[PDB]
Design a protein around this ligand. Structure first.
Ligand code: NA
Ligand code: NA
Length: 365
């Protein structure tokens, strides 16, 4: 039912999002039953934050996003927002953002050591490979800052001092929509079930951004044979049954990833020995700069090799859009999205959905 449609792969045959979509099973923490007052010192909030890497120039898009997340969820639960940027935030940014929430907002700067390329990266080699990716990649002109963002999301955000006393994060990107009321504390949902990571969308990537990522991953695994988890996603990570040319071009990796612009995650997974050693291996290999290794594939591979797959959750009930893709469930809590419509735009976008592989090899839990 949830398997692949072919005409050539052309997306999902029957999207599970069409099924009546409700809340997860088990105990759920409700706002009407608990102290979630924004300034209460004895609230039901766990140690979690909404986080966003965002520039001053993206303020208007951020405000639209905050309005959706607040209306659908955070106006009831009042978790804090923590904003990150390599430059200082303006007073206008601070005033406008804090005006959209009753929760506390924090404004943080990424340190130089978490943003500047590391010493071992040769900037001439960077510029040469960037010129080639610029020539090859569709609707793409390279910038150093894209690579710095990917590296920051991959290995640095969870080392930031501001997050030291936090265990969970919900990553939010400046220009996104949320469509569905969510009436339970998602952070404590994760905590009570010892969940590691939550996603809404699962996509193929551009193999040109990651050609040596899987080869470098295999080198890391050969050097650290005890790191591979028992409940791993090797079948999903190495699948070639939907788009075999992607898997060939990325040298053994399907390119499939959790679409990391949305994440709800356990910071302590990424801080752990296994994932962080993986990140540092990749950091030394140089592919964050000499290629364009995305934080999405890097997170997805890390989770798929080192996490328990039973602790990774599809948040099917969180209606979500980041252009051009959607997670829109069939629920009366949602509005202004079409249930089960994966994409908006030209029909060639349909094949970018990797959930039929993820659901086969890992599951829909
Ligand atoms: Na309450
Ligand atoms: Na290009």
């Amino acid at each position: 039912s949830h398997g692949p449609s072919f005409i050539e792969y052309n997306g999902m045959k029957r999207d599970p999002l069409l099924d009546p979509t409700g809340e997860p099973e088990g105990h759920l923490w409700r706002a009407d039953d608990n102290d979630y007052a924004p300034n209460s010192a004895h609230s039901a909030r766990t140690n979690a934050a909404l986080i966003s890497l965002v520039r001053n120039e993206e303020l208007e898009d951020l405000i639209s996003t905050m309005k959706d997340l607040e209306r659908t969820w955070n106006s009831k639960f009042n978790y804090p927002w923590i904003f990150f940027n390599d430059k200082p935030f303006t007073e206008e940014f601070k005033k406008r953002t804090q005006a959209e929430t009753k929760a506390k907002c924090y404004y943080e700067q990424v340190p130089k050591e978490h943003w500047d390329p590391p010493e071992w990266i040769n900037m001439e080699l960077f510029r040469e490979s960037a010129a080639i990716l610029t020539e090859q990649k569709i609707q793409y002109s390279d910038k150093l800052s894209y690579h710095q963002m990917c590296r920051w999301n991959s290995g640095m955000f969870y080392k930031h001092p501001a997050l030291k006393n936090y265990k969970y994060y919900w990553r939010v990107e400046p220009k996104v929509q949320f469509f569905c009321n969510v009436d339970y504390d998602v952070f404590r949902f994760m905590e009570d079930r010892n969940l590691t990571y939550g996603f809404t969308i699962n996509l193929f990537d551009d193999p040109k951004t990651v050609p040596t990522l899987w080869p470098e991953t295999k080198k890391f695994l050969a050097a650290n044979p005890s790191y591979l988890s028992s409940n791993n996603m090797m079948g999903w990570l190495t699948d070639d049954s939907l788009r075999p040319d992607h898997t060939e071009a990325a040298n053994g990796y399907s390119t499939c990833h959790f679409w990391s612009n949305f994440e709800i995650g356990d910071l302590d997974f990424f801080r752990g020995e296994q994932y962080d050693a993986y990140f540092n291996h990749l950091d030394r290999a140089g592919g964050f700069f000499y290629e364009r290794w995305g934080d999405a594939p890097v997170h997805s591979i890390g989770l798929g090799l080192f996490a328990d797959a039973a602790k990774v959750h599809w948040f099917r009930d969180i209606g979500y859009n980041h252009i051009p893709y959607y997670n829109c469930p069939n629920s009366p809590k949602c509005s202004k999205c079409t249930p089960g419509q994966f994409y908006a735009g030209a029909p060639f976008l349909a094949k970018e959905d990797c959930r039929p592989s993820y659901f086969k090899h890992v599951g829909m839990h």
